[PDB]
Amino acid sequence: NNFELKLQMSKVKGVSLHKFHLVNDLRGNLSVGEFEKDIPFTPKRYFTVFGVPNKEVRGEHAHKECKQFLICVSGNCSVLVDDGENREEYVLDSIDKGIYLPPMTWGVQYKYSKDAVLLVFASHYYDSDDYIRDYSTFKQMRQN
């Protein structure tokens, strides 16, 4: 359903779901994305989450300025995105599926498979002060 087109918008504010160009041939397989085109920003940072125990739960934050883009490059994991009003779960289970999380998207990442690797591109360098880490505070900042 959710990642069938190259680009589709979530009900969750600003969140976009992406299907990256894929070449399958005799010699192997290749998926590709272009920054400022398929991923709607230029990254200053990347990180990878891996080796997550069975049923462990990560995230429970929103970012005030940092844009993020998530691709599960091995295995599978599930993501909940929440704009304060609307929330949805998406399953990142193939290398050509990506999800854009604009700033002020409360996100959780969970149900990682044993060999799952989540890749994240980030618009901003790492800054611990960019995080909102409790949900009620996030809700106040989302109010109209």
Ligand X SMILES: Cc1cn([C@H]2C[C@H](O)[C@@H](COP(=O)(O)OP(=O)(O)O[C@H]3O[C@H](C)[C@@H](NC=O)[C@H](O)[C@H]3O)O2)c(=O)[nH]c1=O
Q: What is the bridge-based pairing of β-strands 97-101 and 16-19? A: antiparallel
128 binds Na ion (CB under 5 A): no
115 binds Na ion (CB under 5 A): no
141 binds ligand X (CB under 6 A): no
Minimum gap (Å) between residue 47 Cβ and ligand X: 4
Token pair of 106 as six digits: 């409360």
* Closer to ligand X by Cβ: residue 3 or 101: 101
- Other beta carbons within 10 Å of 76: 16
Q: Of 106-135, which residues contact ligand X (CB under 6 A)? A: 107, 109, 120, 126
Q: Of 3-42, which residues contact ligand X (CB under 6 A)? A: 23, 30, 32
Answer yes or no: is 58 a known binding residue. Answer: yes
Instruction: Give yes or no: 61 in active site.
Output: yes
Burial per residue of 29-66, b for 16 or more beta-carbon CB atoms within 10 angstroms, e otherwise: eebeeeeeebbbbebeeeeebeebeeeeeeebbbbeeb
Tokens 């989302």 correspond to: 142
Tokens 């087109």 correspond to: 5
What residues make contact with ligand X under the rule CB under 6 A?
A: 23, 30, 32, 45, 47, 49, 58-59, 61, 68, 107, 109, 120, 126
